[model samples]
Target: MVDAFLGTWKLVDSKNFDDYMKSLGVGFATRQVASMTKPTTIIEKNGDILTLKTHSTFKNTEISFKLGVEFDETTADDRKVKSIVTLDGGKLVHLQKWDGQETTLVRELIDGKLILTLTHGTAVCTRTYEKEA
Candidate 1:
């Protein structure tokens, strides 16, 4: 069974990724480098608990938590955001609000497509990603 993408994954390809990162306020230089960089994802799962580490030549990010646990998340780009990541059935969901409430972002991955929702001030932006796998 292809159980929950529970393994190490190398980012061989991505679509609409830069636009999604831009919606998160990632500057041009960062976005350009990020889109050009190849990232490696390490995902470990045991029962309902999982940890994820995404690394690249330029940047890296790691997250650890149980399936239902609510934890704080900070992006690599210096966004002091608060987020709770949870597993809903087979999908991973991230619910986030930034800078104590000036903006918000939600993301989910299902069947290899990544969905991103970003809200800044009063404007909202949405985007998507597809896995190479």
Candidate 2:
């Protein structure tokens, strides 16, 4: 089920990512760097443990956790959050809660492409990824 997300995915398109970052309280310089970089996401699973890695030229973040378990997470922009990942239908759902913000990320595989929707505050960002292998 969740194995559908296991692969190397490269970011091909992003919408309103800057506004999303801004909602996270990212500074101007960091937002500039983030906006220009296309990150790659690699998902791997070992038994019930799942690892999600987001790599980029500016920063790389990796989180490993069991399904349905909530854990502390530090995001790319350095926000401390309580994070949980779950499978809903065929979509991978990630929820993060922080001091003054809550973010919901839904990743779905559609027509061999990964469509990721991120919602923070009132800002919404969409990112599309293509599988590399």
Candidate 3:
């Protein structure tokens, strides 16, 4: 079922992302840029390794790791984090921690669309993505 998500997803809509970025301590300028930039996510797998890539005009970031493995991450928001991603049923749950701050991003496949939910403290944001043919 997870393999159903191995493709490109084009971001379609976002809600409450500004507050979510604020919760992550993103500065005004960076938050503004991030709010306006639409990103595309691409997922790929090889053997036991999975690669998740996020690309936009603002910045491009990629992480390659196995499920449940922790890795040093330099977030696109420029934070150094200890991050891990694991599958919770059909959802991909990613947790990132930095200097006592933590955030979460989850991706779910619903009705053939990718639904992303992001969280930091009390702020939560939802984004939608359409699968690429």
Candidate 4:
């Protein structure tokens, strides 16, 4: 079920949050703060629409999009921003086009695991999350 995507995905670890934030032009202090919290991203899929909600002690963000349609999006945590997502190659592909920065994030379910690929500026990070059940 696409409901499989529902649940809180704990950010148990990070391969390179520092570089990831830096490439986005996030300041040292911001990156430092972001690195400390193991942010958890929760997803809710309804029909062809999907919403990703990220929660942390310092920040909380929610993103909603529909499959095959591109819409402007912004995160409560990141402030003014714009993004769109489309389904491609059996994956949910996100493209963020914000002020002075553009990035792409692709997510797929592989072998019962959720794999995320975030590409922005000079950095690319791949994260994996196992379904709770």
Q: Pick the candidate with the highest lDDT.
A: 2
- Runs off by more than 4 Å, candidate 3: none
Q: Model 2, range 47-97, lDDT digits (tens) per residue?
A: 999999999999999999997999999988888899999998889999999
Question: Model 1: clashing residue pairs?
Answer: none
Cα TM-score of candidate 4: 0.83
Model 1: number of backbone collisions: 0
Off by over 4 Å in 1: 1-3, 100-133
Cα lDDT computed for each candidate against the true fold: 0.65, 0.92, 0.91, 0.74
For residues 1-133, write the lDDT of model 3, one tens digit per residue.
Answer: 3598799999999999999989878899999998898899999999878999999999999999888899999988789999999989889999999889889999998899999999999998999999888
Q: Which of the two candidates, 2 or 3, achieves a greater lDDT against the reference? A: 2
| lDDT rank order | 2, 3, 4, 1
lDDT of 3: 0.91
lDDT string, candidate 4, 1-133, tens digits: 3565678777654676677778777788878888788767889987888889878898887777886677777653363666777767678788877777788888888786778888877788877776554
The local lDDT score (0 to 100) that residue 2 gets in candidate 3 is: 59
TM-scores, all models, native as reference? 0.69, 0.96, 0.95, 0.83
Report the lDDT of model 1 for residue 97: 70
Instruction: Name the runs in model 2 displaced over 4 angstroms.
Output: none
Candidate 4 stretches with Cα past 4 Å from truth are 1-3, 76-79
Error of 2 at 24 (Å): 0.9
Q: Judging by lDDT, tell me the better candidate of 1 and 2.
A: 2
In angstroms, give how far residue 19 of model 1 lies from its true place: 1.1
